[PDB]
Structure formats: C-alpha cells, structure tokens
mmCIF file of all heavy atoms in Angstrom:
data_model
loop_
_atom_site.group_PDB
_atom_site.id
_atom_site.type_symbol
_atom_site.label_atom_id
_atom_site.label_comp_id
_atom_site.label_asym_id
_atom_site.label_seq_id
_atom_site.Cartn_x
_atom_site.Cartn_y
_atom_site.Cartn_z
ATOM 1 N N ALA A 1 7.736 -13.593 -6.776
ATOM 2 C CA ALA A 1 8.517 -12.393 -7.061
ATOM 3 C C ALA A 1 7.680 -11.133 -6.883
ATOM 4 O O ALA A 1 8.145 -10.149 -6.296
ATOM 5 C CB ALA A 1 9.087 -12.465 -8.476
ATOM 6 N N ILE A 2 6.444 -11.146 -7.384
ATOM 7 C CA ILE A 2 5.559 -9.996 -7.202
ATOM 8 C C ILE A 2 5.297 -9.755 -5.721
ATOM 9 O O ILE A 2 5.379 -8.617 -5.233
ATOM 10 C CB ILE A 2 4.247 -10.198 -7.981
ATOM 11 C CG1 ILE A 2 4.530 -10.372 -9.474
ATOM 12 C CG2 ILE A 2 3.299 -9.033 -7.744
ATOM 13 C CD1 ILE A 2 3.285 -10.460 -10.326
ATOM 14 N N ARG A 3 4.993 -10.825 -4.978
ATOM 15 C CA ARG A 3 4.723 -10.683 -3.552
ATOM 16 C C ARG A 3 5.944 -10.157 -2.808
ATOM 17 O O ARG A 3 5.820 -9.307 -1.919
ATOM 18 C CB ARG A 3 4.272 -12.023 -2.972
ATOM 19 C CG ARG A 3 4.140 -12.040 -1.459
ATOM 20 C CD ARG A 3 3.447 -13.305 -0.986
ATOM 21 N NE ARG A 3 2.756 -13.985 -2.076
ATOM 22 C CZ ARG A 3 2.880 -15.275 -2.355
ATOM 23 N NH1 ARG A 3 3.665 -16.063 -1.639
ATOM 24 N NH2 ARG A 3 2.201 -15.787 -3.377
ATOM 25 N N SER A 4 7.135 -10.640 -3.166
ATOM 26 C CA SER A 4 8.353 -10.214 -2.487
ATOM 27 C C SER A 4 8.682 -8.761 -2.795
ATOM 28 O O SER A 4 9.142 -8.025 -1.916
ATOM 29 C CB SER A 4 9.516 -11.123 -2.884
ATOM 30 O OG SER A 4 9.081 -12.461 -3.050
ATOM 31 N N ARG A 5 8.468 -8.329 -4.040
ATOM 32 C CA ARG A 5 8.717 -6.930 -4.370
ATOM 33 C C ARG A 5 7.748 -6.017 -3.628
ATOM 34 O O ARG A 5 8.146 -4.965 -3.108
ATOM 35 C CB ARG A 5 8.632 -6.715 -5.882
ATOM 36 C CG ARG A 5 8.198 -5.315 -6.292
ATOM 37 C CD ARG A 5 7.858 -5.243 -7.772
ATOM 38 N NE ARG A 5 6.447 -5.495 -8.039
ATOM 39 C CZ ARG A 5 5.997 -6.214 -9.057
ATOM 40 N NH1 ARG A 5 6.823 -6.778 -9.923
ATOM 41 N NH2 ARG A 5 4.685 -6.367 -9.214
ATOM 42 N N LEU A 6 6.475 -6.414 -3.547
ATOM 43 C CA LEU A 6 5.519 -5.632 -2.767
ATOM 44 C C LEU A 6 5.904 -5.601 -1.292
ATOM 45 O O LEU A 6 5.798 -4.557 -0.636
ATOM 46 C CB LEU A 6 4.109 -6.194 -2.945
ATOM 47 C CG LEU A 6 3.416 -5.847 -4.264
ATOM 48 C CD1 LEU A 6 2.083 -6.569 -4.378
ATOM 49 C CD2 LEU A 6 3.227 -4.345 -4.392
ATOM 50 N N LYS A 7 6.355 -6.737 -0.754
ATOM 51 C CA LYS A 7 6.771 -6.792 0.644
ATOM 52 C C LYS A 7 7.966 -5.885 0.905
ATOM 53 O O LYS A 7 8.018 -5.201 1.931
ATOM 54 C CB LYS A 7 7.099 -8.231 1.035
ATOM 55 C CG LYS A 7 6.987 -8.514 2.523
ATOM 56 C CD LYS A 7 5.571 -8.891 2.915
ATOM 57 C CE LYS A 7 5.571 -9.929 4.023
ATOM 58 N NZ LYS A 7 4.632 -9.576 5.119
ATOM 59 N N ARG A 8 8.943 -5.880 -0.002
ATOM 60 C CA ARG A 8 10.096 -4.999 0.158
ATOM 61 C C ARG A 8 9.681 -3.534 0.094
ATOM 62 O O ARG A 8 10.142 -2.716 0.902
ATOM 63 C CB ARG A 8 11.145 -5.308 -0.911
ATOM 64 C CG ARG A 8 12.089 -4.154 -1.207
ATOM 65 C CD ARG A 8 13.220 -4.086 -0.197
ATOM 66 N NE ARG A 8 13.679 -5.411 0.201
ATOM 67 C CZ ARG A 8 14.597 -6.111 -0.452
ATOM 68 N NH1 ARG A 8 15.180 -5.640 -1.541
ATOM 69 N NH2 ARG A 8 14.939 -7.313 0.001
ATOM 70 N N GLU A 9 8.805 -3.189 -0.854
ATOM 71 C CA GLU A 9 8.344 -1.809 -0.961
ATOM 72 C C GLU A 9 7.599 -1.379 0.297
ATOM 73 O O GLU A 9 7.725 -0.231 0.740
ATOM 74 C CB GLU A 9 7.457 -1.649 -2.196
ATOM 75 C CG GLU A 9 6.898 -0.251 -2.384
ATOM 76 C CD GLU A 9 6.183 -0.084 -3.708
ATOM 77 O OE1 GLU A 9 6.145 -1.057 -4.491
ATOM 78 O OE2 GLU A 9 5.660 1.020 -3.968
ATOM 79 N N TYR A 10 6.815 -2.284 0.885
ATOM 80 C CA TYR A 10 6.122 -1.961 2.127
ATOM 81 C C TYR A 10 7.100 -1.812 3.287
ATOM 82 O O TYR A 10 7.013 -0.854 4.064
ATOM 83 C CB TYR A 10 5.080 -3.032 2.447
ATOM 84 C CG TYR A 10 4.490 -2.901 3.832
ATOM 85 C CD1 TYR A 10 3.664 -1.835 4.158
ATOM 86 C CD2 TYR A 10 4.765 -3.839 4.816
ATOM 87 C CE1 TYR A 10 3.124 -1.710 5.422
ATOM 88 C CE2 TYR A 10 4.231 -3.722 6.084
ATOM 89 C CZ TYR A 10 3.411 -2.657 6.381
ATOM 90 O OH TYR A 10 2.876 -2.536 7.642
ATOM 91 N N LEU A 11 8.037 -2.752 3.421
ATOM 92 C CA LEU A 11 8.937 -2.754 4.569
ATOM 93 C C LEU A 11 9.896 -1.574 4.543
ATOM 94 O O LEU A 11 10.324 -1.107 5.606
ATOM 95 C CB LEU A 11 9.721 -4.066 4.623
ATOM 96 C CG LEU A 11 8.944 -5.326 5.006
ATOM 97 C CD1 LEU A 11 9.777 -6.566 4.732
ATOM 98 C CD2 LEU A 11 8.518 -5.275 6.463
ATOM 99 N N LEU A 12 10.258 -1.085 3.355
ATOM 100 C CA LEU A 12 11.156 0.065 3.289
ATOM 101 C C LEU A 12 10.524 1.296 3.926
ATOM 102 O O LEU A 12 11.190 2.036 4.659
ATOM 103 C CB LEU A 12 11.550 0.344 1.840
ATOM 104 C CG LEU A 12 12.716 -0.498 1.316
ATOM 105 C CD1 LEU A 12 12.891 -0.304 -0.180
ATOM 106 C CD2 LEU A 12 13.997 -0.160 2.061
ATOM 107 N N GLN A 13 9.239 1.535 3.657
ATOM 108 C CA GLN A 13 8.538 2.650 4.285
ATOM 109 C C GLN A 13 8.150 2.346 5.726
ATOM 110 O O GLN A 13 8.114 3.259 6.559
ATOM 111 C CB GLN A 13 7.292 3.011 3.476
ATOM 112 C CG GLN A 13 7.565 3.254 2.003
ATOM 113 C CD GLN A 13 6.297 3.292 1.179
ATOM 114 O OE1 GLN A 13 6.036 2.396 0.378
ATOM 115 N NE2 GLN A 13 5.500 4.337 1.368
ATOM 116 N N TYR A 14 7.851 1.082 6.033
ATOM 117 C CA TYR A 14 7.429 0.712 7.380
ATOM 118 C C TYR A 14 8.539 0.958 8.395
ATOM 119 O O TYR A 14 8.286 1.442 9.505
ATOM 120 C CB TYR A 14 6.993 -0.754 7.396
ATOM 121 C CG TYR A 14 6.458 -1.242 8.722
ATOM 122 C CD1 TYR A 14 5.706 -0.414 9.543
ATOM 123 C CD2 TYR A 14 6.701 -2.539 9.150
ATOM 124 C CE1 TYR A 14 5.217 -0.863 10.754
ATOM 125 C CE2 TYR A 14 6.215 -2.997 10.357
ATOM 126 C CZ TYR A 14 5.475 -2.155 11.155
ATOM 127 O OH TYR A 14 4.992 -2.612 12.359
ATOM 128 N N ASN A 15 9.779 0.636 8.030
ATOM 129 C CA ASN A 15 10.901 0.764 8.949
ATOM 130 C C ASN A 15 11.612 2.106 8.846
ATOM 131 O O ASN A 15 12.630 2.299 9.519
ATOM 132 C CB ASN A 15 11.903 -0.367 8.708
ATOM 133 C CG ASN A 15 11.480 -1.666 9.360
ATOM 134 O OD1 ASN A 15 11.544 -1.812 10.579
ATOM 135 N ND2 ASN A 15 11.040 -2.620 8.547
ATOM 136 N N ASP A 16 11.111 3.028 8.032
ATOM 137 C CA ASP A 16 11.769 4.316 7.869
ATOM 138 C C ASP A 16 11.600 5.152 9.135
ATOM 139 O O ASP A 16 10.463 5.426 9.544
ATOM 140 C CB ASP A 16 11.193 5.054 6.662
ATOM 141 C CG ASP A 16 12.019 6.260 6.265
ATOM 142 O OD1 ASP A 16 12.042 7.247 7.027
ATOM 143 O OD2 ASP A 16 12.648 6.222 5.187
ATOM 144 N N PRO A 17 12.692 5.570 9.784
ATOM 145 C CA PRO A 17 12.540 6.381 11.004
ATOM 146 C C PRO A 17 11.974 7.763 10.738
ATOM 147 O O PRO A 17 11.308 8.332 11.611
ATOM 148 C CB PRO A 17 13.971 6.449 11.562
ATOM 149 C CG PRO A 17 14.736 5.377 10.838
ATOM 150 C CD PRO A 17 14.101 5.268 9.495
ATOM 151 N N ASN A 18 12.226 8.326 9.554
ATOM 152 C CA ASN A 18 11.752 9.674 9.263
ATOM 153 C C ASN A 18 10.256 9.690 8.980
ATOM 154 O O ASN A 18 9.594 10.717 9.165
ATOM 155 C CB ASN A 18 12.524 10.258 8.080
ATOM 156 C CG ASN A 18 14.012 10.348 8.345
ATOM 157 O OD1 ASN A 18 14.439 10.686 9.448
ATOM 158 N ND2 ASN A 18 14.812 10.041 7.330
ATOM 159 N N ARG A 19 9.707 8.565 8.525
ATOM 160 C CA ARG A 19 8.304 8.526 8.137
ATOM 161 C C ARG A 19 7.397 8.692 9.350
ATOM 162 O O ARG A 19 7.559 8.008 10.364
ATOM 163 C CB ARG A 19 7.985 7.211 7.428
ATOM 164 C CG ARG A 19 6.704 7.258 6.615
ATOM 165 C CD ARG A 19 6.140 5.872 6.375
ATOM 166 N NE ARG A 19 5.175 5.493 7.401
ATOM 167 C CZ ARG A 19 5.475 4.810 8.497
ATOM 168 N NH1 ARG A 19 6.711 4.411 8.746
ATOM 169 N NH2 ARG A 19 4.510 4.518 9.364
ATOM 170 N N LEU A 20 6.439 9.608 9.238
ATOM 171 C CA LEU A 20 5.424 9.825 10.258
ATOM 172 C C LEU A 20 4.083 10.021 9.572
ATOM 173 O O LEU A 20 3.907 10.973 8.807
ATOM 174 C CB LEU A 20 5.756 11.038 11.132
ATOM 175 C CG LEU A 20 4.680 11.442 12.141
ATOM 176 C CD1 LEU A 20 4.767 10.588 13.396
ATOM 177 C CD2 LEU A 20 4.791 12.918 12.484
ATOM 178 N N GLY A 21 3.141 9.123 9.847
ATOM 179 C CA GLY A 21 1.831 9.173 9.242
ATOM 180 C C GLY A 21 1.343 7.782 8.917
ATOM 181 O O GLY A 21 1.664 6.809 9.609
ATOM 182 N N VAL A 22 0.556 7.688 7.849
ATOM 183 C CA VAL A 22 -0.041 6.435 7.404
ATOM 184 C C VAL A 22 0.519 6.092 6.031
ATOM 185 O O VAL A 22 0.537 6.940 5.130
ATOM 186 C CB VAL A 22 -1.578 6.526 7.377
ATOM 187 C CG1 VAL A 22 -2.030 7.810 6.698
ATOM 188 C CG2 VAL A 22 -2.173 5.317 6.677
ATOM 189 N N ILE A 23 0.997 4.861 5.879
ATOM 190 C CA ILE A 23 1.460 4.385 4.582
ATOM 191 C C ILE A 23 0.252 4.185 3.680
ATOM 192 O O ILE A 23 -0.674 3.435 4.014
ATOM 193 C CB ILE A 23 2.267 3.085 4.729
ATOM 194 C CG1 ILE A 23 3.498 3.322 5.602
ATOM 195 C CG2 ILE A 23 2.677 2.558 3.365
ATOM 196 C CD1 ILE A 23 4.384 2.110 5.749
ATOM 197 N N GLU A 24 0.256 4.858 2.535
ATOM 198 C CA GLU A 24 -0.889 4.828 1.640
ATOM 199 C C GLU A 24 -0.831 3.586 0.760
ATOM 200 O O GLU A 24 0.177 3.331 0.094
ATOM 201 C CB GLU A 24 -0.921 6.094 0.788
ATOM 202 C CG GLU A 24 -2.166 6.248 -0.053
ATOM 203 C CD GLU A 24 -1.861 6.776 -1.435
ATOM 204 O OE1 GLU A 24 -1.439 7.947 -1.547
ATOM 205 O OE2 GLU A 24 -2.041 6.019 -2.409
ATOM 206 N N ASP A 25 -1.915 2.815 0.761
ATOM 207 C CA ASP A 25 -1.986 1.566 0.010
ATOM 208 C C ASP A 25 -2.819 1.777 -1.244
ATOM 209 O O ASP A 25 -4.046 1.920 -1.143
ATOM 210 C CB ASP A 25 -2.592 0.461 0.876
ATOM 211 C CG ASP A 25 -2.386 -0.924 0.292
ATOM 212 O OD1 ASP A 25 -1.882 -1.031 -0.844
ATOM 213 O OD2 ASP A 25 -2.734 -1.912 0.973
ATOM 214 N N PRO A 26 -2.216 1.790 -2.435
ATOM 215 C CA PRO A 26 -3.012 2.006 -3.655
ATOM 216 C C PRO A 26 -4.085 0.954 -3.868
ATOM 217 O O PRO A 26 -5.123 1.255 -4.471
ATOM 218 C CB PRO A 26 -1.958 1.976 -4.772
ATOM 219 C CG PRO A 26 -0.659 2.246 -4.087
ATOM 220 C CD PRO A 26 -0.783 1.638 -2.728
ATOM 221 N N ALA A 27 -3.862 -0.273 -3.393
ATOM 222 C CA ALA A 27 -4.866 -1.322 -3.543
ATOM 223 C C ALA A 27 -6.148 -0.976 -2.795
ATOM 224 O O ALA A 27 -7.250 -1.229 -3.292
ATOM 225 C CB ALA A 27 -4.305 -2.656 -3.053
ATOM 226 N N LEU A 28 -6.026 -0.407 -1.594
ATOM 227 C CA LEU A 28 -7.209 -0.046 -0.821
ATOM 228 C C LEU A 28 -7.995 1.074 -1.494
ATOM 229 O O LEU A 28 -9.233 1.037 -1.537
ATOM 230 C CB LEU A 28 -6.802 0.352 0.596
ATOM 231 C CG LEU A 28 -7.930 0.390 1.623
ATOM 232 C CD1 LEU A 28 -8.480 -1.007 1.825
ATOM 233 C CD2 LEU A 28 -7.434 0.964 2.937
ATOM 234 N N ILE A 29 -7.293 2.080 -2.022
ATOM 235 C CA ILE A 29 -7.968 3.154 -2.746
ATOM 236 C C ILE A 29 -8.660 2.600 -3.986
ATOM 237 O O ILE A 29 -9.793 2.978 -4.304
ATOM 238 C CB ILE A 29 -6.979 4.283 -3.097
ATOM 239 C CG1 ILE A 29 -6.655 5.126 -1.860
ATOM 240 C CG2 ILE A 29 -7.544 5.173 -4.185
ATOM 241 C CD1 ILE A 29 -5.412 4.708 -1.119
ATOM 242 N N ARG A 30 -7.992 1.689 -4.702
ATOM 243 C CA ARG A 30 -8.619 1.066 -5.866
ATOM 244 C C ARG A 30 -9.871 0.294 -5.471
ATOM 245 O O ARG A 30 -10.898 0.375 -6.153
ATOM 246 C CB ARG A 30 -7.630 0.135 -6.569
ATOM 247 C CG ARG A 30 -6.622 0.834 -7.462
ATOM 248 C CD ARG A 30 -5.813 -0.182 -8.250
ATOM 249 N NE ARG A 30 -4.386 0.116 -8.234
ATOM 250 C CZ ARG A 30 -3.476 -0.628 -7.620
ATOM 251 N NH1 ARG A 30 -3.810 -1.725 -6.960
ATOM 252 N NH2 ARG A 30 -2.198 -0.263 -7.671
ATOM 253 N N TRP A 31 -9.803 -0.457 -4.370
ATOM 254 C CA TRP A 31 -10.952 -1.228 -3.909
ATOM 255 C C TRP A 31 -12.131 -0.319 -3.588
ATOM 256 O O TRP A 31 -13.255 -0.552 -4.046
ATOM 257 C CB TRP A 31 -10.560 -2.055 -2.683
ATOM 258 C CG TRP A 31 -11.663 -2.903 -2.126
ATOM 259 C CD1 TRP A 31 -12.381 -3.852 -2.790
ATOM 260 C CD2 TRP A 31 -12.165 -2.885 -0.785
ATOM 261 N NE1 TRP A 31 -13.302 -4.424 -1.947
ATOM 262 C CE2 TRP A 31 -13.190 -3.847 -0.710
ATOM 263 C CE3 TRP A 31 -11.850 -2.147 0.360
ATOM 264 C CZ2 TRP A 31 -13.901 -4.092 0.463
ATOM 265 C CZ3 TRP A 31 -12.556 -2.390 1.523
ATOM 266 C CH2 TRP A 31 -13.569 -3.355 1.566
ATOM 267 N N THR A 32 -11.886 0.733 -2.801
ATOM 268 C CA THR A 32 -12.971 1.638 -2.428
ATOM 269 C C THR A 32 -13.538 2.358 -3.646
ATOM 270 O O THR A 32 -14.760 2.504 -3.776
ATOM 271 C CB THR A 32 -12.486 2.645 -1.386
ATOM 272 O OG1 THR A 32 -11.394 3.402 -1.922
ATOM 273 C CG2 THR A 32 -12.036 1.931 -0.124
ATOM 274 N N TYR A 33 -12.667 2.810 -4.553
ATOM 275 C CA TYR A 33 -13.132 3.517 -5.742
ATOM 276 C C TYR A 33 -13.972 2.610 -6.632
ATOM 277 O O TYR A 33 -15.009 3.033 -7.156
ATOM 278 C CB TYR A 33 -11.934 4.070 -6.513
ATOM 279 C CG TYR A 33 -12.301 4.956 -7.681
ATOM 280 C CD1 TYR A 33 -12.547 6.308 -7.498
ATOM 281 C CD2 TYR A 33 -12.393 4.441 -8.967
ATOM 282 C CE1 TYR A 33 -12.879 7.123 -8.561
ATOM 283 C CE2 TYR A 33 -12.724 5.247 -10.036
ATOM 284 C CZ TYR A 33 -12.967 6.587 -9.827
ATOM 285 O OH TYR A 33 -13.298 7.394 -10.890
ATOM 286 N N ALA A 34 -13.536 1.363 -6.820
ATOM 287 C CA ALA A 34 -14.311 0.422 -7.618
ATOM 288 C C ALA A 34 -15.648 0.113 -6.960
ATOM 289 O O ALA A 34 -16.671 0.004 -7.644
ATOM 290 C CB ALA A 34 -13.512 -0.861 -7.839
ATOM 291 N N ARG A 35 -15.659 -0.033 -5.634
ATOM 292 C CA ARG A 35 -16.899 -0.352 -4.940
ATOM 293 C C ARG A 35 -17.869 0.820 -4.898
ATOM 294 O O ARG A 35 -19.077 0.598 -4.767
ATOM 295 C CB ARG A 35 -16.597 -0.820 -3.516
ATOM 296 C CG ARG A 35 -16.123 -2.259 -3.420
ATOM 297 C CD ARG A 35 -17.290 -3.227 -3.482
ATOM 298 N NE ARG A 35 -18.266 -2.977 -2.430
ATOM 299 C CZ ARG A 35 -18.209 -3.501 -1.213
ATOM 300 N NH1 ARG A 35 -17.237 -4.324 -0.859
ATOM 301 N NH2 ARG A 35 -19.153 -3.191 -0.329
ATOM 302 N N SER A 36 -17.382 2.057 -4.996
ATOM 303 C CA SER A 36 -18.252 3.219 -4.846
ATOM 304 C C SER A 36 -18.376 4.045 -6.121
ATOM 305 O O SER A 36 -19.496 4.267 -6.591
ATOM 306 C CB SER A 36 -17.751 4.095 -3.690
ATOM 307 O OG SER A 36 -16.635 4.873 -4.083
ATOM 308 N N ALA A 37 -17.267 4.504 -6.702
ATOM 309 C CA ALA A 37 -17.328 5.533 -7.734
ATOM 310 C C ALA A 37 -17.177 5.001 -9.154
ATOM 311 O O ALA A 37 -17.444 5.747 -10.103
ATOM 312 C CB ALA A 37 -16.253 6.594 -7.479
ATOM 313 N N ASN A 38 -16.758 3.753 -9.333
ATOM 314 C CA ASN A 38 -16.534 3.208 -10.664
ATOM 315 C C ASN A 38 -17.711 2.383 -11.173
ATOM 316 O O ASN A 38 -17.610 1.777 -12.243
ATOM 317 C CB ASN A 38 -15.259 2.357 -10.672
ATOM 318 C CG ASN A 38 -14.700 2.149 -12.067
ATOM 319 O OD1 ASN A 38 -14.901 2.973 -12.957
ATOM 320 N ND2 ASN A 38 -13.996 1.040 -12.263
ATOM 321 N N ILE A 39 -18.824 2.354 -10.442
ATOM 322 C CA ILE A 39 -19.916 1.449 -10.786
ATOM 323 C C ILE A 39 -20.774 2.024 -11.906
ATOM 324 O O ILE A 39 -20.992 1.373 -12.932
ATOM 325 C CB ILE A 39 -20.753 1.130 -9.535
ATOM 326 C CG1 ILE A 39 -19.997 0.154 -8.634
ATOM 327 C CG2 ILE A 39 -22.100 0.546 -9.926
ATOM 328 C CD1 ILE A 39 -20.752 -0.235 -7.392
#
C-alpha cells in the first residue's frame, strides 16, 4: 500500500502535461542532507 501510494503520487506528476522541470524527490534530499549536513 505504501509503495502503491508513492507510485501514484509520482505518476500523477510524471504524466502531467503542464509540468515542466524536475520532479523533486524528498527522499533524495533527505539522503544527501543526512550524508552531509546531519552528521
């Protein structure tokens, strides 16, 4: 259920015709922040 909800949230923005840019992934920001600034 968690994976499917995340997949739906991703696909809604992925297929949006109005969207132009990069879809921001909070997990990636969390990973980089933990690896660099949270130590």
Side-chain angles (χ1 to χ4, degrees):
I2 301 185
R3 172 169 344 130
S4 324
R5 152 192 92 220
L6 283 175
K7 204 87 145 133
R8 157 82 37 86
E9 179 172 359
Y10 170 69
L11 289 168
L12 276 171
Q13 307 167 249
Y14 183 36
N15 280 287
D16 192 291
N18 300 321
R19 198 202 92 267
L20 174 82
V22 47
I23 299 183
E24 187 221 293
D25 194 353
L28 196 65
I29 285 94
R30 281 187 226 112
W31 181 57
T32 59
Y33 187 85
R35 281 280 302 272
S36 78
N38 200 27
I39 285 181

